[PDB]
Amino acid sequence: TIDEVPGMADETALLDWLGTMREKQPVWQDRYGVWHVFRHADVQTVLRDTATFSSDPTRVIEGASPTPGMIHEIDPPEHRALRKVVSSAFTPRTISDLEPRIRDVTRSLLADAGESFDLVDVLAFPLPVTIVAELLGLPPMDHEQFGDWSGALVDIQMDDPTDPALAERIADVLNPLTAYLKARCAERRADPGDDLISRLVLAEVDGRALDDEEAANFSTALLLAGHITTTVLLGNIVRTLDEHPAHWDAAAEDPGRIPAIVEEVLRYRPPFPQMQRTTTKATEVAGVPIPADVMVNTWVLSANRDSDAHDDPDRFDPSRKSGGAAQLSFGHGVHFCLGAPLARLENRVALEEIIARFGRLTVDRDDERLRHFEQIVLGTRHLPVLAGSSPRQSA
Ligand code: HEM
């Protein structure tokens, strides 16, 4: 049939399909025996229940085993212990103190880019890398062998998330970065300062401390998790504003409007449209029977466009209240994004600085249509933009 999800690149086709599935087949089993959950309430059910819906994907991957410290793949009770330890290092003030540096890097990168440039190469890709590397206390740039998440997301085929060859390909690209970070952890254990690696090595809650393997794996997650998403989100923000360009002047008149724009783009175009769980036992969602030991994909993108959860869900409306709102694009329940305040800060500052310098940007399709990611993330690999105004213009 059509027995696998449509690709991410054709966003309109994907959204239309998700709409039909919410209506007609809200819990769906694909040709790989992977289940998919489309309605907002059911996505929340799945994410809340950690006992039934495990975050350990290795349960269903032949030969695979858990990676110490990879907090997003660990279940309670270990998850709770680990989250406490890392939270005691990665604190609110650790994040808020980054604002001036975030602003400095952003302003300097944009000041040199001219009026026609790739937003991703110039800003959205380097900014989060630079910031989180400095937070961790890593050497200026990682101009080294570890590669690029953007390439992996394109080159490693991820159709069937239970395939062992896939888990291997992921470990193949990640292992060198994790080994590098493990060496940095050992170095900070020898001579700790107050960078985040040192704080992670010195952290201890209820007698639980991280070994270098766990700290390195956690630092790997933190690094990639903060990078991919913040890069994709900033592209999505500029793409979405270019579709509703009255908001550029609104935010220039009152930059206080920017946080709400960031939240609404997160709802509208979530960088991670889906999350994966594995059932630990037979269970039902929406009265649909799901067996034990299978993977379940929760479609946050579909939940966010579900009219049961959001009025006029396909309207981009930064004014929406969803009063006392939680942001499903950062998850739900105990794995809720640890990095959300940093993501919000980086994208606020970036949009502030774009508007301060240029007033607006528009997407440039002079040479080609955009190259969308086809899997995993909802976003584009590059985003050529044009500034119709900048401080370079003269009489
Ligand atoms: C807009 C940007 C971001 C988005 C959309 C996002 C999204 C998410 C989502 C959906 C989850 C839940 C995963 C699940 O339930 O399986 C999550 C968890 C996590 N995120 Fe983010 N993230 C973002 C930025 C960041 C940043 C900047 C950092 C690091 C500074 C970060 C670090 C993490 C970590 C460590 C977890 C795992 C928490 C746990 O398992 O307890 N994220 N994020």
Curated annotation (Swiss-Prot):
Pathway of action: Antibiotic biosynthesis; erythromycin biosynthesis
Keywords, sorted A to Z: Antibiotic biosynthesis, Heme, Iron, Metal-binding, Monooxygenase, NADP, Oxidoreductase
Pfam families associated with the record: p450 (PF00067)
UniProt remark on cofactor binding: Binds 1 heme b (iron(II)-protoporphyrin IX) group per subunit.
SUPFAM superfamilies associated with the record: Cytochrome P450
Record-listed substrate binding positions: H72, E73, Q276
Catalyzed reactions per annotation: erythromycin D + NADPH + O2 + H(+) = erythromycin C + NADP(+) + H2O
PROSITE patterns linked: CYTOCHROME_P450 (PS00086)
EC code(s) of this entry: 1.14.13.154
GO molecular function: heme binding; iron ion binding; monooxygenase activity; NADP binding; oxidoreductase activity, acting on paired donors, with incorporation or reduction of molecular oxygen, NAD(P)H as one donor, and incorporation of one atom of oxygen
Region (Disordered): 305-324
Similarity comment: Belongs to the cytochrome P450 family.
Name of the protein this chain belongs to: Erythromycin C-12 hydroxylase
The organism of origin for this protein: Saccharopolyspora erythraea (strain ATCC 11635 / DSM 40517 / JCM 4748 / NBRC 13426 / NCIMB 8594 / NRRL 2338)
